[PDB]
């Protein structure tokens, strides 16, 4: 018997039958922000720098939902963590370099994080 | 039955000592953890790994797998919990795994085994609880 | 004299006398390294053990991270640095650092070397890479 | 000046070694019956911003930790970190335990050892106690 009213009452069992429940209370547009999701996901890639690259995706996805033509494939929310304030402090942009690769990090990442850049700008 | 079958192997390329808890996997037993185990499961160093449509959890102690196996599942926290209580009863029978000293103590394993994961249903158990049983 | 202080138990842990602790070079993980024979780390930011890695049966000194290769090094009484993957758990490499049990380990994260110092009254330099 | 600043004990006893994390702020210590790591104070500064642009802090640079001085008028973009822009500021009798501007600039407060001195916003001669 699942499907509480809930927020959860206790325990791992609750907790882990309530991400279910929430992803059902918003489907829309992927999770977008993993919920508690996030605690296996990283196991399925311990091979090791295959998490970070998948990481990268996701938070690229984040940031924005663009035009998406060819390669500015970002889905997920339209603001969330926007872009571009001029006001914002240090802001978005800096997170946004790390993806404008030649490798700089590793070229499993490196491969994820120039489809990046492509894709949120 | 959601679990198949809870097994001790030795990537010997053979089952050591395992439990078919309800009469199925008799010799099947045996060429699963035969084959998976050896390549550690067919695992990268991660817990959860699924090859020829079975679920495989696991934990390397030496050239041996301790190996529970599923092929359908109930919840996430649950396979680990069973594998994990397990792995505190197997050292107390065997010191560690290693294939010979697991061969010696198949009775003591596999009690365990049927104690642990009644018809396939994660039961828990314990290091005094399983001396009830082999006194 | 004044000083903005604030002493907190961040974790403890109740073992046979630790003759080294260490913080993980790059890591929110601590290691303290007991005369179990066993050296022990824990995350002392979510409490979780980590692992624990059994270097001997006879006290283990030392123990320090070369965070890089992934790996600890540890100097017991078997006058032994055995190293160990601390995500992959075996033994990576087993060699003798001195002629005697090995006090504190020094790891220099930009080099290859780790100085162990020993009560054979001799330090002795090795490279994890070789 | 090496004067105590605390004792600890813990019910573990004979403590064997220390060592300090190079980041700082947890010490990690060893003793007979197990090991303890522990983590130190000061996380974060004390520091407030007036209306004059007097923005003082105590410590850091072009400011000593015993007196007291920062001014910070540089409004330089968002995106980045702006200079320390630092100007000089008179007398301090106490240490900063918090130190602080006055939030539309008149007062300054060194607030130190169960005492607090206050000092003039930008001429720092004794206000008040």
Same mark, same amino acid.
């Given at each position: 018997?699942?499907?509480?009213?809930?927020?959860?009452?206790?325990?791992?069992?609750?907790?882990?039958?309530?991400?279910?429940?929430?992803?059902?209370?918003?489907?829309?547009?992927?999770?977008?922000?993993?919920?508690?999701?996030?605690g296996?996901?990283?196991?399925?890639?311990?091979?090791?720098?295959?998490?970070?690259?998948?990481?990268?995706?996701?938070?690229?996805?984040?940031?924005?939902?663009?035009?998406?033509?060819?390669?500015?494939?970002?889905?997920?929310?339209?603001?969330?963590?926007?872009?571009?304030?001029?006001?914002?402090?240090?802001?978005?942009?800096?997170?946004?370099?790390?993806?404008?690769?030649?490798?700089?990090?590793?070229?499993?990442?490196?491969?994820?994080?120039?489809?990046?850049?492509?894709?949120?700008? | 039955?959601?679990?198949?079958?809870?097994?001790?192997?030795?990537?010997?390329?053979?089952?050591?000592?395992?439990?078919?808890?309800?009469?199925?996997?008799?010799?099947?037993?045996?060429?699963?953890?035969?084959?998976?185990?050896?390549?550690?499961?067919?695992?990268?160093?991660?817990?959860?790994?699924?090859?020829?449509?079975?679920?495989?959890?696991?934990?390397?102690?030496?050239?041996?797998?301790?190996?529970?196996?599923?092929?359908?599942?109930?919840?996430?926290?649950?396979?680990?919990?069973?594998?994990?209580?397990?792995?505190?009863?197997?050292?107390?029978?065997?010191?560690?795994?290693?294939?010979?000293?697991?061969?010696?103590?198949?009775?003591?394993?596999?009690?365990?085994?049927?104690?642990?994961?009644?018809?396939?249903?994660?039961?828990?158990?314990?290091?005094?609880?399983?001396?009830?049983?082999?006194? | 004299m004044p000083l903005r202080l604030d002493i907190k138990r961040k974790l403890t842990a109740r073992s046979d006398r630790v003759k080294s602790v260490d913080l993980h070079p790059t890591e929110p993980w601590m290691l303290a390294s007991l005369y179990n024979?066993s050296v022990c780390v824990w995350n002392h930011e979510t409490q979780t053990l980590v692992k624990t890695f059994?270097?001997?049966?006879?006290?283990v000194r030392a123990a320090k991270f070369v965070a890089?290769?992934n790996?600890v090094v540890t100097?017991? !009484? @078997? +006058?032994? %640095?055995?190293?160990?993957?601390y995500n992959?758990?075996?033994?990576?490499?087993?060699?003798?650092?001195?002629?005697?049990?090995?006090?504190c380990i020094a790891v220099?994260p930009?080099?290859?070397?780790?100085?162990?110092?020993? !009560? @054979? +009254?001799? %330090?002795?330099?090795?490279?994890?890479?070789? | 000046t090496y004067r105590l600043e605390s004792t600890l004990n813990y019910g573990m006893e004979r403590v064997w070694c220390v060592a300090s994390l190079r980041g700082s702020n947890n010490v990690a210590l060893g003793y007979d019956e197990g090991s303890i790591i522990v983590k130190l104070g000061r996380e974060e500064p004390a520091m407030?911003?007036?209306?004059?642009?007097?923005?003082?802090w105590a410590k850091h640079?072009?400011?000593?930790q015993?007196?007291?001085?920062?001014?910070?008028?540089?409004?330089?973009?968002?995106?980045?970190?702006?200079?320390?822009?630092?100007?000089?500021?008179?007398?301090?009798?106490?240490y900063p335990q918090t130190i602080q501007?006055?939030?539309?600039?008149?007062?300054?407060?060194?607030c130190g050892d169960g005492?607090?001195?206050?000092?003039?916003?930008?001429?720092?001669?004794?206000?008040?106690?």
């Amino acid at each position: 018997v699942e499907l509480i009213y809930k927020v959860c009452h206790a325990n791992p069992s609750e907790r882990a039958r309530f991400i279910r429940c929430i992803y059902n209370l918003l489907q829309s547009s992927s999770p977008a922000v993993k919920y508690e999701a996030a605690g296996t996901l990283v196991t399925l890639s311990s091979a090791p720098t295959a998490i970070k690259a998948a990481a990268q995706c996701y938070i690229d996805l984040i940031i924005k939902e663009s035009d998406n033509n060819v390669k500015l494939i970002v889905l997920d929310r339209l603001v969330e963590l926007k872009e571009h304030p001029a006001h914002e402090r240090v802001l978005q942009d800096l997170v946004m370099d790390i993806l404008r690769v030649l490798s700089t990090p590793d070229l499993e990442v490196r491969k994820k994080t120039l489809q990046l850049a492509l894709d949120l700008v | 039955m959601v679990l198949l079958a809870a097994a001790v192997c030795t990537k010997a390329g053979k089952a050591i000592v395992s439990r078919q808890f309800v009469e199925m996997t008799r010799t099947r037993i045996e060429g699963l953890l035969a084959a998976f185990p050896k390549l550690m499961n067919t695992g990268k160093q991660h817990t959860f790994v699924e090859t020829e449509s079975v679920r495989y959890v696991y934990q390397p102690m030496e050239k041996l797998y301790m190996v529970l196996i599923t092929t359908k599942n109930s919840n996430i926290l649950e396979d680990l919990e069973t594998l994990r209580l397990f792995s505190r009863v197997i050292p107390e029978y065997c010191r560690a795994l290693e294939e010979n000293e697991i061969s010696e103590h198949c009775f003591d394993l596999i009690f365990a085994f049927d104690e642990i994961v009644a018809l396939g249903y994660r039961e828990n158990v314990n290091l005094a609880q399983i001396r009830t049983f082999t006194e | 004299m004044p000083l903005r202080l604030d002493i907190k138990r961040k974790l403890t842990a109740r073992s046979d006398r630790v003759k080294s602790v260490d913080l993980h070079p790059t890591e929110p993980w601590m290691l303290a390294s007991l005369y179990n024979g066993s050296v022990c780390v824990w995350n002392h930011e979510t409490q979780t053990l980590v692992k624990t890695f059994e270097v001997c049966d006879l006290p283990v000194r030392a123990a320090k991270f070369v965070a890089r290769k992934n790996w600890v090094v540890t100097g017991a !009484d @078997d +006058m032994q %640095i055995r190293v160990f993957n601390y995500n992959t758990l075996e033994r990576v490499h087993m060699f003798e650092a001195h002629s005697d049990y090995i006090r504190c380990i020094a790891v220099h994260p930009t080099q290859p070397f780790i100085l162990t110092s020993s !009560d @054979d +009254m001799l %330090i002795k330099l090795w490279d994890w890479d070789k | 000046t090496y004067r105590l600043e605390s004792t600890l004990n813990y019910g573990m006893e004979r403590v064997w070694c220390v060592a300090s994390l190079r980041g700082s702020n947890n010490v990690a210590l060893g003793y007979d019956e197990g090991s303890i790591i522990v983590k130190l104070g000061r996380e974060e500064p004390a520091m407030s911003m007036d209306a004059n642009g007097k923005i003082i802090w105590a410590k850091h640079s072009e400011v000593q930790q015993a007196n007291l001085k920062a001014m910070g008028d540089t409004e330089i973009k968002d995106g980045e970190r702006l200079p320390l822009a630092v100007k000089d500021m008179g007398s301090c009798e106490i240490y900063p335990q918090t130190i602080q501007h006055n939030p539309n600039g008149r007062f300054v407060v060194v607030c130190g050892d169960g005492e607090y001195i206050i000092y003039t916003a930008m001429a720092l001669r004794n206000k008040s106690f």
